Design brief:
- The structure is cut from a larger assembly and holds chains A, B and C.
- By secondary structure, chain A is mostly beta strands.
- Chain A contains no helices and seven strands.
- Chain A has one domain.
- By secondary structure, chain B is mostly loops.
- Chain B has one domain: Ribosomal Protein L15, Chain: K, domain 2.
- Chain C is of the alpha/beta class.
- Chain C has a single domain, classed as Ribosomal Protein L4, Chain: A (3-Layer(aba) Sandwich), CATH 3.40.1370.
- In chain C, strands 1-4-2-3 form a four-stranded parallel beta sheet.
- In chain C, strand 2, helix 4 and strand 3 form a beta-alpha-beta unit.
- Classes of the chains: A mainly beta, B little secondary structure, C alpha/beta.
- The interface between B and C is small, with 7 and 8 residues.
- Chain C binds one RNA strand through helix 1, helix 2 and helix 3.
- Chain B: It comes from Escherichia coli (strain K12).
- Chain B: One of its GO terms (cellular component) is cytoplasm.
Chain lengths: 102, 94, 186
RNA sequence: UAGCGGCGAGCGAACGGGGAGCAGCCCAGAGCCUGAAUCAGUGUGUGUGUUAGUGGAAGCGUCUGGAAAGGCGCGCGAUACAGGGUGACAGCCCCGUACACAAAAAUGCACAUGCUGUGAGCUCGAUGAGUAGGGCGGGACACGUGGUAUCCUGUCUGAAUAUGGGGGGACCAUCCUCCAAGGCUAAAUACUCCUGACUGACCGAUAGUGAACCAGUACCGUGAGGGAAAGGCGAAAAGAACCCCGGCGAGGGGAGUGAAAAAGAACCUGAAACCGUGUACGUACAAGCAGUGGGAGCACGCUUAGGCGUGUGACUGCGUACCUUUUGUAUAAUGGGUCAGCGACUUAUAUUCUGUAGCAAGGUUAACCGAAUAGGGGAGCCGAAGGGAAACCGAGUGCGUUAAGUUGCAGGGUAUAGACCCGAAACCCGGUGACCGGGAGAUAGCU
């Protein structure tokens, strides 16, 4: 299931992020993904004397299920699903809606 | 219309449950008359499976109301059957 | 009585006593409950103090973590039904269905190809949404393209389940299927 | 059930037919020609399953809305609307899903196989030689070796082998079966330590395996053995930065995160008994199952008085708890501290009766087959024409006559299974130095 890979534009579908797009930083084993500036969190950082703590609130990014996000086809300007086919050399993923090839 | 079907009245009873609830109360003539070869004789009795398996004794005992004019041969025939079976037109002889 | 196919005006005569008998509520109740009991699966058991891990009494059911005073071994709830009673129930249910005009008959209900879209379009033309489809000889083109439809079922004459006739509001017959069911039921 | 049975409790046939497959062979040995059927091993190839796996259809706006999968409106796929995950219920968000494919190797199974080993087919001998049987000294069948069938054995006799010898019926005669005393035979017959899937009108935590929780753990016992209680924050730790007090702890408060902090880690909802605070009432001159009918008074809403409701009850007539056996009882027969949870007449086979459903002088299927609740299957069982022991009578014989019984469902009874539940002492086996597990939820009486 390599539908979502690294360095790809994805748009959320459900939950506090309808419409907003972003770039996937990476993916996790459980399927959760990280996209910059999509679900901001105000996590509080416990004061640690060592490790050179910057100090204060830290604005990091939380984890969002892959289901809530889908690859956005900028060519058609609309969210669409993906499929797989065999080419001469290897296998690559292609969008739906007339089968745009990446 | 599955939720429109009920059983007959009086066919279901919950039954008693002692304790629970203080206020809850507490060979003949008719035989082998027509069996496709029901001739009165000692043979075929075992095959027909009408009188046990090891039963050999046979009799044509009757109780009035003669309704099967069947002729009897090969069995114990006496004057008694003469006055009863013949009333229906049948013949009885040894 | 004569039933009009409403497609070719080829009504087929049927025995009056078969589709004209009075609706016997008790017989249908008995057959339905017998079938439901037969559907039961005998999978249930527990351990008594005799067969409860431990030693002794501590294992007595009154004591906590003990056995069950009223343990029941697995059993089968199915009960046999007389063949004549089953035939009478089938005749009564068929008579009741035809009396209220919930039974539909056509000369032949077949699909040229195993395409669910064609079947859905045909059903829409028939103005039927949740109905029972029953015919004679099995058709792969129709049977294959009917499983996905939960509210649409296709079977053969030998598999006429009496309870199934109640779940579906309407039943669709076939010219050969009617004759087959009439001759087999007798 | 025939039978057995102190003819008592109780114990317990055979034949026949219906079902799955049915196989009888080889040696005691030679003649003709062959390694021709078959049975095993060694290597090629084909197909069919496993150990990784691939492809595999389809959606959006508005509203409540923490977040939509929910309502509304309009579309699409379906040989796939089985399941699972996804901030609330998903065919069209994702893994799967029916369907089509995939192996260098290990490998199981079927085949043409070359080679390596016994071995085609017909002919006519051959019926298993200290073998039966008998007998002596002993042991087992209610039984002190007894009339002792029959078996075990240290030892002695002992014929035939289709001109033949055993067994059975017959009083004897007659009549029927085999080749006894040398070997082999997958097949249909029962079950699960484990493995994949599937199904639960089974359980959801005092239940369900003892254990959903790091359980056969802690713990008890030198010893064998016994044996627990204990799982749920939040969609996402986004786990309270920071400030104040406190002892630079614990416990906290404010702010912030978080829908929610009546989600703060001991983290869903959080009962009763129990424990404290505030609110309104009564009680410091009054005697007893502490309640009940009336009831003035006191405080709050209300008919914005109207005699209305709620909260308390100065006084008044009456007023000796709950379960059991006992004629009956706190009386001096009998037991209970409270709360939450746990716990009690079902089921298996027979027999009797009622209601209910058809069929009906017929009713009715078992096993099994089976497109597996269909249908087949008439094996089988019950009843439909008197009873008197039999004989023999035969609407006739003190007893009866033409009315009708069977099969499913539910219920009311009886017997056998421990069958409404709880509660002994003793005995045996196998172990541990008196104790442990089993017979045994033992057994009879009585609470």
């Amino acid at each position: 299931a390599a539908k979502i890979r690294r360095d790809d534009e994805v748009i959320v579908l459900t939950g506090k992020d309808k419409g907003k797009r972003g770039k996937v930083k990476n993916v996790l084993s459980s399927g959760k993904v990280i996209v910059e500036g999509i679900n901001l969190v105000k996590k509080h950082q416990k004061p640690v004397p060592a490790l050179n703590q910057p100090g204060g609130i830290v604005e990091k990014e939380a984890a969002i299920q892959v289901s809530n996000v889908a690859i956005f086809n900028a060519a058609t300007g609309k969210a669409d699903r993906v499929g797989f086919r065999f080419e001469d050399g290897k296998k690559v993923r292609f969008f739906k809606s007339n089968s745009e090839t990446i | 219309r599955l939720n429109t079907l009920s059983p007959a009245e009086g066919s279901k009873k919950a039954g008693k449950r002692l304790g629970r609830g203080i206020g809850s109360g507490l060979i003949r003539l008719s035989d082998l008359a027509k069996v496709e070869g029901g001739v009165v004789d000692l043979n075929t009795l075992k095959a027909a499976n009408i009188i046990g398996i090891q039963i050999e004794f046979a009799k044509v005992i009757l109780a009035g109301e003669v309704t099967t004019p069947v002729t009897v041969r090969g069995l114990r025939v006496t004057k008694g059957a003469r006055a009863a079976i013949e009333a229906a037109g049948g013949k009885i002889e040894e | 009585m004569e039933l009009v196919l409403k497609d070719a005006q080829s009504a087929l005569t049927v025995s009056e006593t078969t589709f004209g008998r009075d609706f016997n509520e008790a017989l249908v109740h008995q057959v339905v409950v017998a079938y439901a009991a037969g559907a039961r699966q005998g999978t249930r058991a527990q351990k008594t103090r005799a067969e409860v891990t431990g030693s002794g009494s501590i294992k007595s059911p009154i004591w906590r973590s003990g056995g069950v005073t009223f343990a029941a071994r697995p059993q089968d709830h199915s009960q046999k039904v007389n063949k004549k009673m089953y035939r009478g129930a089938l005749k009564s249910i068929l008579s009741e269905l035809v009396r209220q005009d919930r039974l539909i008959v056509v000369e032949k209900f077949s699909v040229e190809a195993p395409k669910t879209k064609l079947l859905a379009q045909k059903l829409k033309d028939m103005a039927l949404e949740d109905v029972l489809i029953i015919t004679g000889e099995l058709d792969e083109n129709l049977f294959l393209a009917a499983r996905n439809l939960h509210k649409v079922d296709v079977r053969d004459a030998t598999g006429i389940d009496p309870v199934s006739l109640i779940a579906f509001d309407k039943v669709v017959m076939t010219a050969d299927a009617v004759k087959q069911v009439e001759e087999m039921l007798a």
